Nucleic acid binder design. Structure first.
Lengths: 220, 261
RNA sequence: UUUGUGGGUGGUGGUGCAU
């Protein structure tokens, strides 16, 4: 009887909602069919026609004249950021263990300049660019040109060869940890090109540039 | 003394959009934005007794279709009456989220929100509950930054009230652009707040609670680059004569270690 | 108002208890 009662209650509910919504539907449609057009025509036969807003307009003009921004969220505690970073290092450790177990355009611009400051020219080019696809394509032809110059000369000494190459390599690091797929397909078809060159001639296409290609990929 | 057909039709569509809480809208009400005489129309419909979904769809209609000053008069009358109506009808002072949505559409329409609702509310003195409500709406939804900083400048020019300082806390934490003329307005507010060691004042000496303290913290926090250096050491004097217990020295560090334009 | 590029996320929270 209790279960039947609850069901009777729901029946009463559905009945009430259906009948009332029907009534509202009938009335709304009736007015919408007659009194609607009536009211529209007759009210149209009729008619119907500052410090705050002044300050609003004035300060909007002011805003257009002088927008200014500098984002700054709440600073972070020493132990807070340090432990978050230590934990991020732990997460990296875990991911590593789990993984362990289971061109001519660039050439023309840069050689038109000068290598010993084309480090700076390229960094600037990248700065301008970083202020997606621009970045990726330039990074690819950058690694190409790195191989190129390192296979072009070994005249400079520890003072001007090492510094250029190592600052470039730091740029390589950061661009790698941001974009990688362009680098990946670059180096994949790079293996293709160098294996085809080996098959053409085994030793007449291998050099310090391809050796340092091995080196940079192995540390990247 | 209007025609009886307008009278009957608009009061009966008023009862129709009283009995409405679900469904669709009339041919009359969707040709109302095809006309001009909305004040007379809705004053014969007697708007202030409808349903939350009904005020929802009326606001959706007028914000989607109409323009600035019509939105001003409509939003002032209708939304102020319905906003006060909903809050003081709810015993724990809660607003229906469909009327909150009406407020959201009022923000979304460009010159509809400050001309219609918020500023006559500041004149008519809402309670701190309604102040916090409209502040949460202003947090979630965003108008053009020009209009938002305009609301900032005019509320800092208008006198102090607890809704005034709660709203200005909401804007300064909403983190839009602060022009140097606007920081003229804001530090003018602040020099009518501080102590004038010859003509003192009620706004210059009265009691100023902790939400205003959070507002002072976010002002000197985000906006230290637009306060000119006279405004900087004036904020120094302000915070030293009216400091706080744990917010104040944070304001002082932000204030001195801020460089500006 | 939207788009090309970076990004905020728990409380229109329940909640005892003492004033």
């Amino acid at each position: 009887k209790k279960t039947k009662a609850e069901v009777m209650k729901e029946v009463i509910a559905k009945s009430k909602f259906y009948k009332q919504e029907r009534q509202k539907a009938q009335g709304i449609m009736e007015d919408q069919i007659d009194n609607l057009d009536d009211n529209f025509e007759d009210v149209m036969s009729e008619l119907m026609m500052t410090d705050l807003d002044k300050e609003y307009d004035i300060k909007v003009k002011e805003l257009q004249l002088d927008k200014r921004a500098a984002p700054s969220d709440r600073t972070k505690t020493e132990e807070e950021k340090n432990a978050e970073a230590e934990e991020k290092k732990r997460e990296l450790e875990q991911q590593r263990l789990d993984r362990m177990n289971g061109d001519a355009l660039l050439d023309q611009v840069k050689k038109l300049d000068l290598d010993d400051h084309p480090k700076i020219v390229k960094n600037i080019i990248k700065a301008y660019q970083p202020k997606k696809e621009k970045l990726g394509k330039f990074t690819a032809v950058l690694l190409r040109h790195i191989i190129f110059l390192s296979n072009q000369n070994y005249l400079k000494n520890v003072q001007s060869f090492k510094r250029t190459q190592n600052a470039l390599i730091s740029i390589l690091k950061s661009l790698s940890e941001k974009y990688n797929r362009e680098l990946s397909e670059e180096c994949r078809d790079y293996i293709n090109e160098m294996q085809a060159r080996y098959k053409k001639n085994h030793f007449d296409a291998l050099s310090n540039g391809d050796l340092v290609f091995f080196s940079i990929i192995g540390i990247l | 003394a209007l025609p009886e057909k307008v009278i009957k039709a608009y009061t009966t569509v008023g009862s129709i959009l009283k009995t409405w809480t679900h469904g669709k809208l009339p041919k009359l009400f969707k040709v109302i934005p095809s006309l001009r005489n909305w004040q007379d129309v809705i004053y014969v419909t007697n708007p202030e007794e409808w349903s939350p979904h009904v005020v929802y769809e009326a606001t959706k209609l007028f914000v989607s279709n109409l323009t600035a000053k019509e939105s001003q008069k409509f939003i002032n009358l209708i939304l102020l009456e319905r906003f006060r109506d909903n809050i003081e009808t709810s015993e724990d002072h809660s607003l229906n989220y469909h009327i909150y949505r009406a407020v959201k559409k009022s923000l979304y329409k460009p010159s509809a929100f400050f001309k219609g609702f918020l500023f006559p509310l500041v004149e008519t003195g809402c309670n701190v509950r309604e102040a916090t409500i409209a502040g949460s709406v202003l947090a979630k939804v965003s108008v053009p930054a020009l209009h938002s900083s305009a609301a900032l400048s005019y509320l800092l020019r208008l006198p102090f009230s607890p809704p005034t300082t709660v709203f200005i806390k909401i804007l300064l934490d909403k983190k839009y652009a602060l022009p140097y003329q606007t920081v003229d307005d804001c530090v003018y507010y602040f020099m009518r707040f501080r102590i004038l060691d010859g003509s003192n004042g009620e706004d210059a000496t009265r009691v100023l609670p902790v939400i205003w303290h959070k507002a002072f913290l976010t002002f000197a926090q985000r906006y230290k680059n637009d306060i000119t250096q006279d405004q900087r050491d004036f904020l120094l004097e302000t915070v030293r004569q009216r400091g706080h217990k744990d917010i104040g020295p944070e304001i002082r560090r932000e204030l001195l270690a801020g460089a500006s334009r």
